[PDB]
Amino acid sequence: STPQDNANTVHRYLEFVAKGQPDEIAALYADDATVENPVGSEVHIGRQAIRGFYGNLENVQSRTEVKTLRALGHEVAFYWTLSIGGMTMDIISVMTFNDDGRIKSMKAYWTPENITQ
Amino acid sequence: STPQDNANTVHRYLEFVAKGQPDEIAALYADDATVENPVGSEVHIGRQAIRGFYGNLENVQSRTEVKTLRALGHEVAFYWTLSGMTMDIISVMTFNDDGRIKSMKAYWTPENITQ
Ligand SMILES: O=[N+]([O-])c1ccc(O)cc1[N+](=O)[O-]
Numbered sequence: 482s483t484p485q486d487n488a489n490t491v492h493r494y495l496e497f498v499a500k501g502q503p504d505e506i507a508a509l510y511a512d513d514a515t516v517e518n519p520v521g522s523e524v525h526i527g528r529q530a531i532r533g534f535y536g537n538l539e540n541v542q543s544r545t546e547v548k549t550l551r552a553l554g555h556e557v558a559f560y561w562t563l564s565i566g567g568m569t570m571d572i573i574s575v576m577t578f579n580d581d582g583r584i585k586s587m588k589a590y591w592t593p594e595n596i597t598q
Numbered sequence: 599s600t601p602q603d604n605a606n607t608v609h610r611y612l613e614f615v616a617k618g619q620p621d622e623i624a625a626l627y628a629d630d631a632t633v634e635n636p637v638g639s640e641v642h643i644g645r646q647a648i649r650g651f652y653g654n655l656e657n658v659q660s661r662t663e664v665k666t667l668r669a670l671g672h673e674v675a676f677y678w679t680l681s682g683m684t685m686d687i688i689s690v691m692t693f694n695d696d697g698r699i700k701s702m703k704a705y706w707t708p709e710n711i712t713q
C-alpha cells in the first residue's frame with residue numbers, strides 16, 4: 482500500500498472510533514496484527530483479541546481531531562485528540578501497515594496526564 | 599532502565615543536537631542501535647554509522663523545544679521543534695536494558711518546516 486492509502490486507513494480508523502464501531506475497527510487490522518495501548522502494557526495479538534479489546538467502544542459516540550499526521554514508508558505517525566462525553570485525550574499514535582494495506586501494528590502513547598476537561 | 603531515565607536521555611540527546619555534539623549523541627546510542635530519519639529512508643545501523651550520520655551537526659548551533667513527551671515502558675514518544683526555519687517533529691526512541699538508545703525513528707517532511 483502507499484502512504485496515501487495508509488493515511489486514508491488512519492482516517493477510517495478514527496471514523497470508526499468516533500462512531501463506536503469495533504467490528505469496523507477490527508476489520509482494518511491484519512489477522513496477526515498487534516495493538517499496544519498504552520505502550521508499556523501487554524500487547525494484544527491477533528484480530529480476535531483486538532476485536533475484544535475494542536469491544537467497549539460499542540455504541541459510543543465520540544469525536545476525533547487530527548492535529549498532524551505523517552505517512553512515511555509503511556508507517557503513519559499521528560498526533561490527535563479523542564473527545565468522549567466529558568474528557569479530551571491527547572494522543573501520539575504510530576501504525577504500521579502490511580503489503581495489503583491492513584494495519585500490522587498500532588502503538589498509542591498517552592497517560593491520564595494527557596486527559597483534560 | 600526506567601521511563602524517567604529514558605526521558606532524561608531524550609533531554610540529553612536534544613541538547614547534544616542543539617550544541618552540535620555528534621560524538622556525544624553517538625555515545626547515547628547502543629552499539630547495534632538503529633536510526634531511521636526520516637522514517638521511510640534507509641536505516642542507519644550500528645553506532646559507527648550513526649556517528650557518521652550525525653557528523654554534519656559538529657559545532658552547529660540549533661534550538662530544540664519539547665512540546666510533549668511520553669515515557670512509557672522502554673519507549674519515549676516526543677513531539678518537538680528544531681530551529682530561520684523551524685521543524686515540528688514526532689519522534690520515537692526505544693531503550694535497551696542498560697538505558698542506551700536501541701532505536702530512533704523521526705516522522706517529519708519538508709511540509710513540517712515553517713519560517
Ligand atoms: O485509550 N483510548 O481510548 C484509545 C487510545 C488510542 C486509540 O487508538 C483508541 C482508543 N480507544 O479505544 O478509544
Ligand SMILES: O=[N+]([O-])c1ccc(O)cc1[N+](=O)[O-]
Nearest residue numbers: 615635652655685687689704
Ligand atoms: O532533521 N534532522 O536532521 C533531525 C531530525 C530528527 C532528529 O532527532 C535529529 C535531526 N538532526 O540531527 O538534525
